[PDB]
Design a protein around this ligand. Structure first.
Ligand SMILES: Cc1cc2nc3c(=O)[nH]c(=O)nc-3n(C[C@H](O)[C@H](O)[C@H](O)COP(=O)(O)O)c2cc1C
Ligand code: SF4
Ligand code: SF4
Ligand code: SF4
Ligand code: SF4
Ligand code: SF4
Ligand code: FES
Ligand code: FES
Lengths: 221, 111, 32, 456, 98, 147, 212, 105
């Protein structure tokens, strides 16, 4: 949408807000590093950026500078990775960040994501891109989220809400709104209306028999 | 004559195309960035005793700035009166704009 | 204009570490 | 003389596709995994490569190249005379619209992949594996990381993998959202902490890849079958499909079906039986069908009249001037706006182009604006030919195959739906009282004092 | 010395000592009734020792044919005049000299 | 009637700038198949060094001897080499007068006629001036009419 | 050792491990380029140096193709004519109509290689218009006009490799990829003005020289 | 004195056609090359060779012409490019130790 691909020097996002990873995150960092060859520690920029996007709230310019400092990189080389990839909110987002797939598989399957987007806009009185006045939700459309046989589907923060009707996707959101106070009201992640995962709703047409194990292998092994 | 947009801004942007194409080297142009950062001429001279009146300069203009008026009666007492600076050429456009516009209107589709 | 989920305190974690990052803590390159 | 399809339940690779068992290592033991990995590793890499080559397996990530041939390449002439590491990069990016097969492998049976990397890595003599997960698959990665964690715990992968004396590590790396990072080289640069802009090949990962080291990228399904290809046999797997196309396949069948689902089914199956039996058939019956995308969004469209006897096969879909792709099957009814469906894909590729090269950075946006015009008929018919030419100036003039990925879907639409493109160009002309100009301008643009070049 | 053919123009390259015999042949031969000199000009090539290229243009109204003959000179080498064969060449050669 | 309306009141919208179908089309012309300026002919230059050659062994049109395979190339260079060592006058000297007679055989026996410049009849020829059917001055005046 | 290939029918020798474009400047064969510079790393981005090579399904980037033992290369075939005409159409589709107000005019590789290798006329007339991007402040020396950028990467390679100034880069993706610094910061390098001359187009121009 | 040289390639372009030949120019003298007209500010001149140049195929031709015309003449020789193989694969070479810079493409 209107995501600028340059920096705007705002009072909540400027190179003067200090950033420092929490001690609990510091332990997570050194795990990340051990997976890469020592001299290629820049290979962890995406894990650290994501790890900084979850502690601070969004990928501010200070968090990228912090990561650039840890991994001994020129900060521009980090500004490039952050801006190239779309899971990095370089502007702040709401408490929930509604991502609805609007690609052709999700525009045809089920109701077809047109009513799903309409339901989101109907429930929140917001348009695409803007966030709600109380900051609980940010809404965008996205590209194939990799769950096409379960369309219409949406990704809120880290959970996929598949197989949506414009009625259920309305109650998925209102559950999220009330789930901030009591965690017991959090919606169940996954598909809605019956289907468990990528099954055939009108019964299972495959893998209904007892599975085999190491039974059938030749003597040569 | 040098011409202006409907707002009074000069149309000339100092590309120097007419200075290049002139067959008689009668045009001398000096430009700079103006106080507001605009690409505008500081000098604009036509030696009217070097010109051959071919129209190649108005042919080449990207923005219809330099034009040749329908005026032929401008005979002078001295040759210094025939060395036109930007002050004289803008004044010519400021006076002749209604015909310059009506000539361009009538002749534009063929250009 | 509206509010946001932006870090107010330096030590607090606005978005949870997630199940993946926890499984990087139980990691071990050696047999048990 | 024989039909391909309807394979038995005792003939499938991904038994727990439908979530029969929890993904823990204990249940994977009953599945037949990690069974005789000791023997498989101690058998030389040559024996593993031969078993893969015999299987006829071709890549399942949308290109279908011989995987046994491919993994031999990284065993170059003096592969044992270098101190550099060797890397297996498992492509789990799951980018193609229509495709969701590998998220099911990663959650339901990660150990079919965790063990698959070991046999894949061993055959290529690699020192470690990196698995590149699209970041949007967060639970897919936590589950898979748990499988890796448990595989390290019991000595299945790690220092002494399965007690075989082979040293092999396995790491997850998650992305931050980019379909182009599913490309061969784009995967490698992203892993090096760079923007996922693909690299030019003459340098080939088998020589210089991740970290400049010998490398091989392979799909999750490609790697998730190879151990079974050994424990069951190259002849066992080479028993399906047609002469040059073998084995099983997953099939994410979305769109206007009455029961969308993925299914593992024999390659070279006729598409209709695949649609009409595993997924319940076309919504509103078969006659309501208009067109199918037989791969993901990167394969050309197929009209109803050729779908009737089309084998879902690598070679067979090629003769249809299409591809098997990722074996994603998006079907469309006779109530679809087909140009809108195609134009949405042309919009997807405009957003998923990296921007490194001239033909796809300028051509993915140019084609999108043409397609957005063609939906509403703002154009004249001779522009359809002009759009055909534009796609063919992208087709083989790019660093990566994403240029083909946005040019092919447009071309296939021109190939079977031009009268639909022509019908709504004609309608817009009568609607505005004049044939549209090139670029979408109205016939009277010059009359209303617009700027219209000769020939627009 | 050589001849070249471009589209419909045939050029004949000759050494300066042969100006009289060659133009005598082109004026009087039956297949070469080139009885006008259309033109005589020079082209300066300062990269060449012999700077000047003397280019004559002939017409044959009998055969509706044109032909070009080229020779060379410098600031000190002279060229044989053709004023004895072509009265009209008097002023052209004066222009080359001037 | 004359100059009415003036050209300065002719409507601009009426005149339409003309584009031809191939050159101006948007989908059936690469520029390079109409780039006739860069397909310009090169001058074709023949010197005495390889006029003796063309007399020695013939031409791709009318070869003199077979020049079959190898051992013909060594004769091919000699024809060019003999031209560069001895010119046309020397070549006709040693072959005698019948080589000079074969030179006229290149044009059918007579010397060639120079090419005419009309081609109004389909072939490049002399334009055939004839007396016009109607003579404007009749016969009364010393000016006659030709076509 | 110098291997032997034939380019455009003529034979050329050159050290192995050379670019095929390099074998062309030795063989006196002109090949169009935008991203490739002799003094920089090979980038492969513009697609203007595509030539025909035997046993090769698609045109090859001559700047990035290693000279092989005995290759045969055509720089003047219908394949190369079609590629150079088509790539020129792409680079000129969102390029601004600013040749009169640009300081690169009369000294432009894009107009000189558009006149020599592209069609004479554009087919781009979209009602949606061209791409426009905002200008940038990278110090007192380099005037910016970034609509003109053709994404060659010559200044980012120069600033990062030659000059050791890793502040310039390309943030973004797709048709919205933009050269500049993310933060509005001055370029601090004594070799800075060298990107003005390296710039194929006039997006990165000289502030003191502007319009004079 | 005249200057005989092959013009170097402009820094601003990659085309090399103006480098093909040898050019002969006339050196600027200290006085009379340019001065400003009092009337319009146009640039006057008393050097009648300022707008002239000759072009030659070889350096020898330029010397021969200047010797024969009686010019003083100075020759500069063109600076030649030092060849070096360029490989795209250098962009991605393995580094066993510290990365000396982070390449950005
Ligand atoms: C734009 C683009 C996107 C791709 N996305 C994926 C993907 O998401 N997953 C995948 O397995 N392969 C993907 N591929 C194919 C890979 O480049 C590569 O062929 C494959 O991952 C490994 O080869 P294999 O499937 O033959 O083993 C993509 C290719 C392109 C050009
Ligand atoms: S061509 Fe026209 S716009 Fe350009 S400098 Fe000359 S008068 Fe000004
Ligand atoms: S009309 Fe006059 S000023 Fe214009 S180009 Fe011709 S001579 Fe020069
Ligand atoms: S084809 Fe070019 S622009 Fe498109 S993704 Fe690949 S490298 Fe980027
Ligand atoms: S850079 Fe673009 S605007 Fe500037 S002169 Fe060249 S083509 Fe014209
Ligand atoms: S600013 Fe100039 S040098 Fe840098 S990428 Fe753009 S066109 Fe290339
Ligand atoms: S299209 Fe929406 S998830 Fe694949
Ligand atoms: S010069 Fe080879 S692609 Fe740019």
């Amino acid at each position: 949408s209107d995501t600028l691909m340059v920096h705007r020097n705002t009072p909540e996002n400027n190179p003067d807000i200090p950033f420092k990873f929490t001690p609990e995150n510091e332990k997570i960092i050194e795990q990340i590093l051990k997976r890469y060859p020592p001299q290629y520690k820049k290979a962890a920029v995406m894990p650290l950026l994501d790890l900084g996007q979850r502690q601070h709230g969004f990928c501010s310019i200070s968090v990228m500078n912090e990561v650039a400092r840890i991994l001994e990189m020129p900060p521009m080389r980090v500004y490039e990775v952050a801006s190239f990839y779309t899971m990095y909110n370089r502007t702040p987002v709401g408490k929930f960040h509604v991502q609805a797939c609007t690609t052709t598989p999700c525009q045809l399957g089920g109701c077809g994501s047109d009513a799903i987007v309409k339901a989101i806009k109907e429930h929140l009185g917001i348009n695409q891109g803007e966030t709600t006045p109380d900051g609980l939700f940010t809404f965008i459309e996205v590209e194939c989220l990799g769950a096409c046989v379960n369309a219409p589907m949406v990704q809120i923060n880290d959970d996929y809400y598949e197989d949506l009707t414009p009625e259920t996707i309305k109650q998925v959101l209102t559950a999220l709104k009330e789930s901030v106070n009591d965690v017991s009201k959090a919606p169940k992640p996954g598909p809605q209306s019956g289907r468990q995962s990528c099954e055939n709703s009108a019964g299972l047409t495959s893998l209904t028999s007892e599975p085999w194990g190491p039974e059938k292998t030749r003597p040569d092994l | 004559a040098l011409r202006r947009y409907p707002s009074g801004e000069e149309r000339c942007i100092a590309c120097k195309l007419c200075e290049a194409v002139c067959p008689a080297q009668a045009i001398t142009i000096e430009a700079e960035e103006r106080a507001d950062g605009s690409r505008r001429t500081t000098r604009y001279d036509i030696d009217m005793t070097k010109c051959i009146y071919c129209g190649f300069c108005q042919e080449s203009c990207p923005v219809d700035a330099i034009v040749e008026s329908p005026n032929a009666e401008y005979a002078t007492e001295t040759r210094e009166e025939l060395l036109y600076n930007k002050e004289k050429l803008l004044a010519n456009g400021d006076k002749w704009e209604p015909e310059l516009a009506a000539a361009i209107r009538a002749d534009a589709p063929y250009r | 204009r509206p509010s946001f989920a932006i870090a107010r305190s330096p030590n607090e974690q606005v978005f949870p570490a997630g199940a993946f990052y926890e499984s990087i803590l139980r990691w071990n390159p050696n047999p048990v | 003389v024989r039909t391909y399809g309807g394979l038995k339940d005792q003939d499938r690779i991904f038994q727990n596709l439908y979530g029969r068992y929890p993904p823990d290592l204990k249940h994977a033991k009953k599945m037949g995994d990690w069974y005789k990995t000791k023997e498989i590793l101690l058998k030389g890499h040559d024996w593993i490569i031969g078993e893969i080559k015999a299987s006829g397996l071709r890549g399942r990530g949308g290109a279908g190249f011989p995987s046994g041939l491919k993994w031999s390449f990284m065993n170059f002439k003096d592969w044992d005379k270098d101190n550099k590491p060797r890397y297996l990069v498992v492509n789990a990016d799951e980018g193609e619209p229509g495709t969701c097969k590998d998220r099911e492998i990663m959650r339901k049976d990660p150990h079919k992949l965790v063990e698959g990397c070991l046999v894949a890595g061993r055959a290529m003599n690699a020192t470690a594996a990196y698995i590149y997960i699209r970041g949007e698959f967060y639970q897919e990665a936590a589950i898979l990381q748990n499988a890796i964690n448990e595989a390290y715990a019991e000595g299945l992968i790690g220092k002494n993998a399965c007690g075989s004396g082979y040293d092999f590590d396995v790491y997850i790396h998650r992305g931050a959202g980019a379909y182009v990072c599913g490309e061969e080289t784009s995967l490698i640069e992203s892993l090096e902490g760079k923007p996922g802009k693909p690299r030019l090949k003459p340098p080939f990962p088998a020589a210089v890849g991740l970290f400049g080291c010998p490398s091989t990228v392979a799909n999750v399904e490609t790697v998730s079958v190879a151990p079974t290809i050994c424990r069951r046999g190259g002849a066992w797997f080479a028993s399906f499909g047609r002469e040059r196309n073998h084995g099983t396949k997953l099939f994410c069948i979305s769109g206007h079906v009455n029961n969308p689902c993925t299914v593992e089914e024999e390659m070279s199956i006729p598409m209709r039986e695949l649609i009409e039996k595993h997924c319940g058939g076309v919504r509103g019956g078969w006659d309501n069908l208009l067109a199918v995308i037989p791969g993901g969004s990167s394969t050309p469209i197929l009209p109803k009249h050729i779908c009737d006897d089309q084998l879902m096969d690598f070679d067979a879909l090629k003769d249809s001037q299409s591809g098997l792709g990722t074996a994603a099957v998006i079907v469309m009814d006779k109530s679809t706006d087909v140009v809108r469906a195609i134009s949405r894909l042309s919009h997807f590729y405009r957003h998923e182009s990296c921007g490194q090269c001239t033909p796809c950075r300028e051509g993915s946006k140019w084609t999108d604006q043409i397609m957005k015009r063609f939906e509403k008929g703002m154009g004249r018919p001779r522009e359809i030919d002009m759009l055909q030419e534009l796609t063919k100036q992208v087709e083989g003039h790019t660093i990566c195959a994403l240029g083909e990925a946005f040019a092919w879907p447009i071309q296939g639409l021109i190939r079977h739906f031009r009268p639909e493109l022509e019908a709504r160009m004609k309608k817009f002309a009568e609607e505005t009282g004049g044939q549209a100009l090139a670029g979408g301008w109205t016939h009277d643009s010059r009359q209303k004092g617009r700027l219209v070049s000769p020939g627009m | 010395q050589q001849f070249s053919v471009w589209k419909d123009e045939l050029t004949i390259y000759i050494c300066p000592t042969g100006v009289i015999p060659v133009f005598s042949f082109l004026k009087y031969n039956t297949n070469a009734e080139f009885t006008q000199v259309s033109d005589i000009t020079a082209v300066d090539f300062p990269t060449r020792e012999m700077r000047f290229e003397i280019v004559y243009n002939l017409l044959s109204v009998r055969h509706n044919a044109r032909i070009r003959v080229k020779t060379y000179a410098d600031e000190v080498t002279p060229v044989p005049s053709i004023t004895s064969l072509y009265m009209g060449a008097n002023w052209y050669e004066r222009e080359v000299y001037d | 009637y004359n100059r009415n309306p003036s050209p300065g009141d002719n409507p601009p919208l009426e005149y339409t700038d003309p584009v031809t179908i191939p050159a101006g089309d948007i989908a059936d012309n690469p520029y390079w198949k109409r780039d006739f300026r860069r397909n310009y002919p090169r001058p074709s230059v023949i010197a005495q060094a390889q006029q003796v050659a063309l007399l020695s062994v013939g031409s791709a049109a009318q070869p003199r001897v077979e020049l079959i395979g190898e051992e013909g190339t060594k004769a091919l260079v000699a024809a060019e080499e003999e031209g560069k060592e001895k010119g046309v006058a020397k070549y006709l000297e040693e072959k005698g007068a019948e080589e000079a007679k074969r030179v006229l055989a290149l044009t059918g026996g007579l010397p060639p006629t120079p090419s005419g410049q009309t081609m109004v009849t389909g072939q490049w020829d002399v334009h055939k001036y004839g007396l016009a059917e109607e003579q404007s001055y009749g016969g009364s005046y010393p000016c006659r009419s030709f076509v | 050792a110098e291997v032997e290939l034939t380019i455009d029918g003529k034979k050329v020798s050159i050290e192995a491990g050379s670019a095929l474009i390099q074998a062309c400047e030795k063989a006196g064969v002109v090949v169009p380029r935008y991203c490739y510079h002799e003094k920089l790393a090979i980038a492969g981005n513009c697609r203007m140096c595509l030539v025909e090579v035997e046993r090769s399904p698609k045109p090859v980037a001559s700047c990035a193709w290693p000279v092989q033992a005995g290759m045969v290369v055509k720089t003047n075939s219908p394949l190369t004519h079609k590629a150079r005409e088509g790539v020129m159409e792409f680079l000129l589709a969102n390029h601004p109509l600013d040749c009169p107000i640009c300081d690169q005019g009369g000294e432009c590789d894009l107009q000189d290689q558009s006149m020599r290798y592209g069609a004479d006329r554009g087919r781009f007339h979209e009602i949606g218009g061209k791409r426009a991007v905002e200008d940038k402040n990278i110090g007192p020396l380099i005037k910016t006009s970034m609509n003109r950028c053709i994404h060659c990467t010559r200044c980012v390679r120069f600033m990062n490799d030659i000059a050791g100034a890793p502040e310039l880069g390309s943030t973004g993706r797709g048709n919205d990829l933009q050269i500049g610094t993310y933060l509005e910061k001055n370029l601090d390098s004594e070799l800075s003005g060298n990107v003005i001359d390296l710039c194929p187009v006039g997006a990165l121009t000289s502030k003191p020289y502007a319009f004079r | 004195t005249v200057r005989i040289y092959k013009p170097a390639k402009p820094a601003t372009q990659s085309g090399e056609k103006n480098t093909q030949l040898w050019r002969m120019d006339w050196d600027v003298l200290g006085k009379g090359h340019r001065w400003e007209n009092p009337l319009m500010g146009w640039q006057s001149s008393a050097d009648f060779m300022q707008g002239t140049h000759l072009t030659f195929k070889t350096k020898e031709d330029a010397i021969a012409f200047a010797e024969k015309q009686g010019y003083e003449y100075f020759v500069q020789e063109p600076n030649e490019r030092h060849f070096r193989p360029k490989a795209y694969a250098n962009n991605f070479l393995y580094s066993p130790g510290k990365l000396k810079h982070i390449r950005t493409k």
